[PDB]
Amino acid sequence: ADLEDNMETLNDNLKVIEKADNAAQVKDALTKMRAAALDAQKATPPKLEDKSPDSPEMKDFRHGFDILVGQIDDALKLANEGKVKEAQAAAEQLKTTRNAYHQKYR
């Protein structure tokens, strides 16, 4: 159990992603991740406790998504701009942040 938050909305696209992938499909799947991802980042991810007890807490979260939510967008305009024909190659690649984030709460 972790960001069960952004994850709950992730299972939706993560699923429609399996059978989905073509241009229109994968095109709609991403949009969902963009609107959903924007919520996790824009949403107060209290899971880790926003009450930034130390200080540099929040800003610390804008880093995780900032990177992920940053790739999702490049995956959309990339498929609608024709990065879709060559994308099919990245779709099989995956993203799982190379730095397999910790299991969750360290």
Swiss-Prot record:
Domain of life: Bacteria
Record carries keyword Metal-binding: yes
Molecular function as annotated in GO: electron transfer activity; heme binding; iron ion binding
Biased composition annotated in UniProt, kind: Basic and acidic residues: 47-60
Span list, region Disordered: 38-60
Binding annotation for heme b: 7, 102
Swiss-Prot/TrEMBL cofactor(s): heme b
Range covered out of full length: 23 to 128 of 128
Gene for this chain: cybC
Lineage start: Bacteria, Pseudomonadati, Pseudomonadota, Gammaproteobacteria, Enterobacterales
Subunit structure of this chain's protein: Monomer.
Cofactor note: Binds 1 heme b (iron(II)-protoporphyrin IX) group per molecule.
Keywords tagged on the record: Electron transport, Heme, Iron, Metal-binding, Periplasm, Signal, Transport
Name of the protein: Soluble cytochrome b562
Free-text function comment from the UniProt entry: Electron-transport protein of unknown function.
Any GO CC annotation of this UniProt entry: periplasmic space
Native source species: Escherichia coli
GO biological process, one term: electron transport chain
Compartment annotation: Periplasm
Family: Belongs to the cytochrome b562 family.
